[PDB]
Structures are given as structure tokens and as C-alpha cells.
Swiss-Prot record:
UniProt name for this protein: Lysine-specific demethylase 4D
Organism annotation: Homo sapiens (Human)
Post-translational modification: Ubiquitinated via 'Lys-63'-linked ubiquitin chains. Deubiquitinated by USP14 with the help of TRIM14 leading to stabilization.
Gene that produces this protein: KDM4D
Full protein stretch here: 11 to 341 of 523
Cofactor(s) in the UniProt record: Fe(2+)
A GO molecular function held by the record: histone H3K9 demethylase activity
Length: 331
């Protein structure tokens, strides 16, 4: 078995190897990459997402989210308070303000310490889940706006044609902005490209050990657990590495820098934070290996997680028994 310790793998494809996305994903899995839940892909040196970032300041963040924390430093929840719209230029200036900027630090490890010690005492503002793309239309390789669609994968594998579309999303982050412990909708893959700015630190639990993280989460967030049988789908709970280590939960960590791709694998729980002002683009995708994960994916039926038009069809086709109760939560 390849990669039996489930370490995060880092790949350096040549420009030749960067032509066929599906094939490269299948290569990484041949080497065991999915066992970690997360992989880093460093693009060929010749490749670029676009020529410059010089004209992005007029993108609108219609609903910036202020991430307010409750709990203790290593075990907390966050709620998103909606703020007034602002442009990317306005947001960048805010991120660079004395109130919100990254503190002085020695290296990524010191910064990680400061994040876990101090996150809960601040409320950074995240420009998340903005439909759009920063890839130039002429970028042919690993263009997250030109990927094969999940609906087309389901059609190719299963023969059934369904409605729905699959488009990317932009994330504008600042120091301390946080992504809570989650897997993707329908336990899909995700791919995330860090277009610009400061790094993003990731934590991940191997898919084979996801239920260990779920059991810990039920113990640490016991009211949330009683409220919903899949409450990590709400994307609100944080657990620190120290706490995970105290409870024997297998995980790994890695820092993504600008210009790098990360891939999350089906049922790979992940969480993390941004080091400073940055812009990431991400999208879900599927492969044939995903289908079985999609059929087994948990679902939020309490009604909090409230998810896309396109997830309807996935549930309807892969999870027909759940169908019914799940759409009661989404209507
Ligand atoms: O970048 C973020 O805030 C969150 N991204 C992801 O969870 C992802 O790409 O799957
Ligand atoms: Mg602009
Ligand atoms: Ni994710
Ligand atoms: Zn729920």
C-alpha cells in the first residue's frame, strides 16, 4: 500500500505532465496521495494563472463575513456576521490596517503559535464564496474555470443526465481568517489555487480516520452534536492541533504559498487559516473513485447547512432514500 503513514505528498509536475488534469490526479492517487486527505501541487515553472494581478481591486465582496469566535483557544466555534459590501481594494486596505494586519513573527511556526493562542480574541473579516475566476481564459492547464464538471462525471460513470452547474469561487482572506473543520459537499474533492498574497496553513485528517475526528467533535461540541447528526457540515467548529494531539487524532499540517495548488480528497477533513491578505480560488470536482463516497456522504438535515442547487441532484441520484428528509432541511 502506498503512503501507509498518510503523509501529505508534494508533487512537482513538468509542463508535459500538467496537460492532462484527470490523468495527473489518478497518478497522485497511484502514489498514495489521497491517503493523507490533502496534496500540494507546485505548477511547472513555465506556467502562470494569468499575466498580472494588477487590475483586481474592483471585484466586489458583496457580503464580507466577520468571523466571531466563542469558546476556548483550542476548541471554539465561529459565527459569521454579515458586513456591508466592499471592493477588493477596500478589503486589502482593511487587511493591511493596524487592527487587522499580520503581527511580527519569526517564521510560519511562530505565526501558527500566535494564531492558536490568540485567534479567539479577534474577529477577522473573510471575503468568502464569491462566484468567479481569476484564471486567464487562455490558460489551458489547470484552469479551475475550465475543468470537467461533476454532472458530466456522474453522467459518464452512471449514465444519468442531471441538471446543475459547477463553477469556481474566490476567497479573499486576511490574518486569522479561518476555515472550520469540514469535508466537501457530498464528500467531493476540492482544488484550491492560491493566486496571490500571504500563505494559508492547512490541517487535515486522513480519510480512513475521519470518524475519529467526528467522534472527538461530538464530545467537544455536545449540544451541536445533539442538534444535528452531521453538524460539521455547518462549517463552524475549530479544534487545535494541540487538542487533536491530546486526543490521539491522526492529522497532518502544511502551509500553501502563493502560486501553489492544494487538492483535498473525498472525505478528507480539513481546516486552516490565512497568514495575511490573500486571494484563493477553489472548486469541487469528482473522479470515478468519488462515486462511492458520494453515496455514503453524511448529510445535515437540521437545516443549518443549506446547500446549492446542484447538490440536489447529487442527493437525488446517489442517495434516493435520504432525498425526501434532506430536501425538507433545504426547503
Ligand atoms: O480556502 C478556504 O477558505 C477554504 N477552502 C477549502 O476548504 C477548499 O479549498 O476546500
Ligand atoms: Mg477589478
Ligand atoms: Ni474545503
Ligand atoms: Zn445540521
Amino acid at each position: 500500500a502506498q503512503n501507509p503513514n498518510c503523509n501529505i505528498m508534494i508533487f512537482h509536475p513538468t509542463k508535459e505532465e500538467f496537460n492532462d488534469f484527470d490523468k495527473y490526479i489518478a497518478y497522485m492517487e497511484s502514489q498514495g496521495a489521497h491517503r493523507a486527505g490533502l496534496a500540494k501541487i507546485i505548477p511547472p515553472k513555465e506556467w502562470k494563472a494569468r499575466e498580472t494581478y494588477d487590475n483586481i481591486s474592483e471585484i466586489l465582496i458583496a457580503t464580507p463575513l466577520q468571523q466571531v469566535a466563542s469558546g476556548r483557544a483550542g476548541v471554539f466555534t465561529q459565527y459569521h456576521k454579515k458586513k456591508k459590501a466592499m471592493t477588493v481594494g477596500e478589503y486589502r486596505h482593511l487587511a493591511n490596517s493596524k487592527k487587522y494586519q499580520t503581527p511580527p513573527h519569526q517564521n510560519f511556526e511562530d505565526l501558527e503559535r500566535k494564531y492558536w493562542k490568540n485567534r479567539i480574541y479577534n474577529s477577522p473579516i473573510y471575503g468568502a464564496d464569491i462566484s468567479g475566476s481569476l484564471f486567464d481564459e487562455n490558460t489551458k492547464q489547470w484552469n479551475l474555470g475550465h475543468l470537467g464538471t461533476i454532472q458530466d462525471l456522474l453522467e459518464k460513470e452512471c449514465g444519468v443526465v442531471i441538471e446543475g452547474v459547477n463553477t469556481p469561487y474566490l476567497y479573499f482572506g486576511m490574518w486569522k481568517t479561518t476555515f472550520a473543520w469540514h469535508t466537501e459537499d457530498m464528500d467531493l474533492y476540492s482544488i484550491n489555487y492560491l493566486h496571490l498574497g500571504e500563505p494559508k496553513t492547512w490541517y487535515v485528517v486522513p480519510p480512513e480516520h475521519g470518524q475519529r475526528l467526528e467522534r472527538l467533535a461530538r464530545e467537544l461540541f455536545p449540544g451541536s452534536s445533539r442538534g444535528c447528526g452531521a453538524f460539521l457540515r455547518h462549517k463552524v467548529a475549530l479544534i487545535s492541533p494541540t487538542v487533536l494531539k491530546e486526543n490521539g487524532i491522526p492529522f497532518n499540517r502544511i502551509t500553501q504559498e502563493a502560486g501553489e495548488f492544494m487538492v483535498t480528497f473525498p472525505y478528507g477533513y480539513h481546516a486552516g487559516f490565512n497568514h495575511g491578505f490573500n486571494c484563493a480560488e477553489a472548486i469541487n470536482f469528482a473522479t470515478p473513485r468519488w462515486i462511492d463516497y458520494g453515496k455514503m456522504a453524511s448529510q445535515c438535515s437540521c437545516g443549518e447547512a443549506r446547500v446549492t442547487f446542484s447538490m440536489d441532484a447529487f442527493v437525488r441520484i446517489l442517495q434516493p432514500e435520504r432525498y425526501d428528509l434532506w430536501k425538507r432541511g433545504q426547503d
